[PDB]
Structures are given as C-alpha cells and as structure tokens.
Amino acid sequence: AHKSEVAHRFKDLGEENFKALVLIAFAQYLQQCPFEDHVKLVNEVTEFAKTCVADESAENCDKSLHTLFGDKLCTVATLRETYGEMADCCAKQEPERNECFLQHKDDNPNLPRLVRPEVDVMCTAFHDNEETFLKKYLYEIARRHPYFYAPELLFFAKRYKAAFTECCQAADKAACLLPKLDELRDEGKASSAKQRLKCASLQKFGERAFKAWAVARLSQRFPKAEFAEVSKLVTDLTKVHTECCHGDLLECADDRADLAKYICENQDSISSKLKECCEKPLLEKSHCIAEVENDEMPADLPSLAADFVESKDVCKNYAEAKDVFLGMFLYEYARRHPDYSVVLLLRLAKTYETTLEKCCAAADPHECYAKVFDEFKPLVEEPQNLIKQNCELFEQLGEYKFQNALLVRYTKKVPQVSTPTLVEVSRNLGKVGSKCCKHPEAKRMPCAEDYLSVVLNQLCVLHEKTPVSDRVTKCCTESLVNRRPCFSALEVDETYVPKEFNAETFTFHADICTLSEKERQIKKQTALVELVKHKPKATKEQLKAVMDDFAAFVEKCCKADDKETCFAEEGKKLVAASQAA
Ligand SMILES: COc1cc([C@@H]2c3cc4c(cc3[C@@H](O[C@@H]3O[C@@H]5CO[C@@H](c6cccs6)O[C@H]5[C@H](O)[C@H]3O)[C@H]3COC(=O)[C@H]23)OCO4)cc(OC)c1O
C-alpha cells in the first residue's frame, strides 16, 4: 500500500479539493458545530497534510484517515453539554469510534431557517471574500444533508461559484440569480435524495443488494458492454458508494475520479454515448458519466429462452455459482429491457432465483422454469397499470389536486404517521407525476418507479427516527425493492382509532393570507391531513368537497379587511359543516 494515506489523498485530490472534502466530512459528522470551528479544524488538517506530504517520515500521520479525522474532531466535540449525547463515543477508539459519528447523523435536524438575503448584498459580500463564502456554502449544505454525495457537492459548489462570478457583475442582478440558483437547489435536493437512497440501501440491506441494483442499472445503461466490463464497473462504483456512505469521503472522491478516468478511457468497450462527457473537466466528467443517456439497443439479441429456461443445465450452473449466475441473468434482462424499472428488474431476478431455489433441486428440474418467464407478466403488468392510472388521474387534476389526492390516499393508508413527514412525502409523490408523466410509454416507468422508491425511502428514514406506524416499519424493513408494492397494496387501516376532534387544527390565521404560494399550499395540505386523520372513514368525494370549501373561504376573505371576523366566522361555519358532514 501507500504509506501516509493522508498524504496520498492530498496528492491525488489536490489542495482545494482536499480542503473542501475535509470540510464536507467535518460538517456531516458535526451538524451543530459552528462554521469557524470547522474552518479551524480543516486548516489544521491541511497544514498537517502539507507537512506529511513534505516528508513522509512524520511520526504522527502513520495513522489512518479515520483515526486522524477523529482525533482532530472529537477533541473539539469532547464537551457533552452542547451536542447532547454526542461526546460519549469519543472515549472509545477505532473502529467503533467511526460508528460514533456514523450512527449519530441527524437526517432532519432542527437547524435555524435560512434568510436568503438580497442578491446585491449577497454577491457584494461574495466579491468581498469568495473563499470564506464558498466554504460557508459548503458547510451549510453539508449540515442539512448529512448523506450528500461529496463529489457531486464539489461540482455543485463549483457551479455555484461560476454563477456568482459570471452573472451578477452584469447589469441586472436577480434576473440570473433567482432562477438559476433555484434550479441548482432543486438539483441538490434530488441528488441528496438519490444518495440517501443509495446509502440507506447499503447500510440496511447489505452490499449485495446495492451490487445487484448497480448491475441492473448499468446493464440498462450500457447494453453494448460485455459482462466482464459491467462487473468491473459495478465493483468499482459499489466500492465508491460504500466509501462515501461509510464516511470515507476523500478516498471515495479519489475512486470516483479513477472510475471516470477508466470509463472514458474504455468508452469503446462500454458505450458510444460517452464521447461527449470527459471532454469536460473532472467534476463535469464524473457528472456526465453518472447521468449519461442509455445506449442504443443492440440488434440480434436472443430471447433468453434457450439459455435460461430451455437449457437443461440451468439449475446446475446456478448450483456452481449462484451470485454470478443471477448477475448474468440480471445483466442480460436489463440489457433487453431498458424501459423496465431498475427495482422491477431486481424483483424479476428475485422471483427467478426464488423459483429456482424452490423446485429445480427437487423432482424433475425442467418442469418449472420452462414457464418461469410467464410469472413475470403480472410482475410487470402491475407497475405499468399503476403508473398509467396515476398519470391519468394527474392529467386532468393538475399539480395541487394530484397532491391532495395522493395525500388523502396515503393518509387513509397509514394515518399514524406524523403530519409534516406525511405532507412532504405527498408533495414529492405528486412531483412524481409532475416530472415524468409527460414522457411516452417507453420512459415513464424509470422515472416513476425509481423516484417513487426514492420518496418512499425518504418516508422510511423519516419514520425510523420516531417509529409510530407498525405497517410502515414492517414493510420498510421488509425489502428494499418491494417498498412501492407494499405502499400501493396497503388498504385503509380499520384498527386505527380516529383522532380526537381539535378545533385548532381546522382554524386558520392572518399569516396564511400573506405567506408565499408554497407555504400556503403546505398549510392547506396539513389541514387536509388533520381532517382526514379526524375522520378516516369518510369517502374521497367528501374530503374533496370540504377541501374545496376550505380553498373557497381562503381565497374569499384573505383580500378583504376585518381579517379576524372572516377567520372566526368561516372557521366556525366549516367546523359545523364538517361535523355535520
Ligand atoms: C445552490 O446550491 C444549493 C443550495 C441550497 C441551500 C440554498 C437555498 C436557496 C438559496 C441559497 C442557498 C445556499 O446558501 C447560499 O450559500 C452562502 C453560504 O455562505 C454565506 C455567506 C458567507 C459569507 C457571507 S455570507 O451566504 C450564503 C448565501 O447567502 C446563500 O445563497 C446553500 C447553502 O447550503 C444550503 O442548503 C443552502 O437562495 C434561494 O434558496 C440547497 C441545495 O439543494 C439542497 C443546493 O443545491
């Protein structure tokens, strides 16, 4: 190996990348420490890295990256008064002292809300001091998203710096800042959600589940590449995502850069869509590789019948190698079905292996798998019909009405869940159809099923901290690929005792008449959640009508005077109406 691995990482990543990655790692481990302490720690670490790269014979950096980072970290966090039950695990040492910070990551911290100052003062402070401003941006974005993907974060910071340096020195200021930065924040939220999905899969269902997922995704993405190249790529990026998800940020970025270099070195052996990615810089190179379009469908592809169902030695070949055989099957199937969802391909592979384990090593083997591909017809027909009906229900209802419909549906399904997480999950579930119902019936399903799984994993992780619904936990821990089939097959919870009537939850105030559109919509959806929880047995049309009445008075008397009079009168009237249904 390479002695003084901190020096090796510093040499490979560079100076500024090393500093930014160390800042990201520190901010993700400590989500409550102030920015100045993180800057001081990062500066000390990078001076140590400079000293050790200057002379490898240093007597201190013979230690590993994890113990070095912990030593520089938990001495500041050695006080168990401000961070709560956080300094306890600094007492122990490697390797449990890494779990110290791994298990203490807070997905939903109660950090103070951002103010978002005006554009002019914002980028004049940017011009006043850029490095501190960008470090503050990285620290703030890493605080609220402890499971962010670090090289993606570096790319986002680079794009943010480029936007600031490019489009506020011009004539107008906000015209470029607001829409561009809104697009970047939406991209950041989406990337954080995807990386949280990957990290949760790796940390819960094992490395094999993520390896199978990545094999399916890459085979769907690189149909031309042979199985050896796909296996090498999935091993490399599985190591990468394990390293980021385990807190090994520096080596994770290093390995992602190496993977991008390999991929654009061997494009011709992998895919033809990569010819336009690595001409970009390293960060943009990796981003393009991670988001490259699917390659063209190869011709003369067999139907999988002669090799996987008709072959008489299929169960034997499974017997010698189970993991390799299932990887080959999943790779071939994902090659032949790019329109199929990745988790759908995982479900199909699981069904195939369950059938093979069930019978081929019992009685006549051939008298099962000759018809095993007939078992996949309902497995693919269910998601197609589900997303078809969801997109149809979305097309004439629109954004907000679709949000309301999904919200009342999921509140009926699992009323025990807390209101804010339920509202957020419903909002994202409406954004599903908002983003990929416009595609034809050849690319709707990837968006649909994949980002449905992303949002459902967000629900599962938000529910893990305060487990209150038995079914939600039961089928969030059950399987990673069957989350959406569970949350679709769940029926109305009969055992749920209706929530006690509280008039406060159905009464609005002056603030909603002057909030933004998003905040007013969220408050209205929260009121809908409370109403459905109060009367879970009501029908869909009744809730639709009462929500129509809610919007009716909200847009009736938010523009007139005597606000309190309207609030009181309308609240009492609609409370009486809802009580009388
Ligand atoms: C654009 O990138 C993203 C930003 C964000 C949010 C976010 C959301 C915004 C915004 C700015 C910011 C940023 O805050 C900016 O960063 C500066 C950080 O440094 C401080 C200062 C340093 C020295 C003086 S001020 O000022 C800050 C700026 O005001 C602010 O625009 C990020 C800082 O960390 C975050 O979480 C923040 O204006 C409109 O809505 C979320 C993203 O996805 C989840 C994302 O992709």
What top-level class would CATH report for the domain 119-201?
mainly alpha
Residue nearest to atom 42 of ligand 1 (CA): 185
In CATH, the number for domain 5-103 is 1.10.246.10
CA angle 399, 433, 339 (to 5 degrees): 165
C-alpha atoms less than 13 angstroms from C-alpha of 306 in its C-beta half-sphere: 3
Distance separating alpha carbons of residues 578 and 481, to the nearest angstrom: 40
Q: Class of the 203-290 domain?
A: mainly alpha
CB 146 within 8 A of CB 31: yes
- Measured distance CA(299)–CA(316) in Å, rounded: 29
Distance (Å) of CA 295 to CA 170, 270, 441, 558: 40, 9, 18, 53
Q: Is 511 annotated as belonging to a binding site? A: no
- Residue whose entry in the numeric block shows the structure tokens 């001081």: 40
Fold topology of 384-489? Serum Albumin; Chain A, Domain 1 (1.10.246)
Q: Is 397 exposed, middle or buried (0-12, 13-18, 19+ CB in 10 A)?
A: middle
Residue 101 Cβ contacting ligand 1 at under 6 Å: no
Taking a C-beta distance cutoff of 8 angstroms, is the pair 543, 528 a contact? yes
Tokens of 195: 């990386």
**Burial (Cβ within 10 Å: 0-12, 13-18, ≥19) of residue 190:** middle
* Structure-token match 């990337």, residue found: 191
Q: Do domains 304-381 and 503-581 have the same CATH topology?
A: yes
Q: Which helix (H) or strand (E) covers residue 572, if one does?
A: helix 563-580
Tell me which residue has its CA closest to atom 41 in ligand 1. 185
What are the residue ranges spanned by the domains of the chain? 5-103, 119-201, 203-290, 304-381, 384-489, 503-581
Can you give the resolution of this entry in Å?
3.4
Instruction: Indicate if ligand 1 lies below 6 Å from the C-beta of 127.
Output: no
Query: What is the full DSSP assignment across 502-534?
Result: -GGGG---TGGGTS-HHHHHHHHHHHHHHHHHH
- CB-CB neighbours of 2 under 10 Å: 10
d(CA 257, CA 262): 9
Technique used by the depositors: cryo-EM
Task: Kindly report the protein residue whose alpha carbon is nearest to atom 38 of ligand 1.
Answer: 116
Q: Which residue has its alpha carbon closest to ligand 1 atom 17?
A: 137
End-to-end CA distance of the chain: give it in Å, rounded: 73
* Cα distance between residue 534 and residue 517, in whole Å: 26
* The two three-digit tokens of residue 146, written as one number: 């402890």
Ligand 1 atom with the shortest distance to the CA of 140: 34
- Taking alpha carbons only, the member of 499, 310, 335, 307 closest to residue 417 is 499
User: CB-side exposure of 569: number of CA atoms within 13 Å?
Assistant: 9
Q: Name the nearest CA neighbour of 402 among 424, 434, 425.
A: 434
The phi and psi torsions of 192 (rounded to 5 degrees) equal -65, -40
Which residue's alpha carbon is nearest to atom 45 within ligand 1?
A: 185
Fold of 503-581: Serum Albumin; Chain A, Domain 1 (1.10.246)
- Domain spanning 304-381, CATH architecture: Orthogonal Bundle (1.10)
138 close to 23: Cβ distance less than 8 angstroms: yes
Q: In sequence order, which ranges of 4-34 are alpha helices (DSSP H)? A: 5-13, 15-29
The CB of 232 under 6 Å from ligand 1? The reply is no
Q: Which of 24, 138, 141 has most ligand 1 atoms within 8 Å of CB, for mutation?
A: 141
Instruction: Say what angle helices 376-413 and 517-534 make with each other, to 10 degrees.
Output: 90
> How far is the C-alpha of 247 from the C-alpha of 489, rounded, in Å?
36
Q: Which amino acid is at 296?
A: E
Dist. CA 427 → ligand 1 center (Å): 22
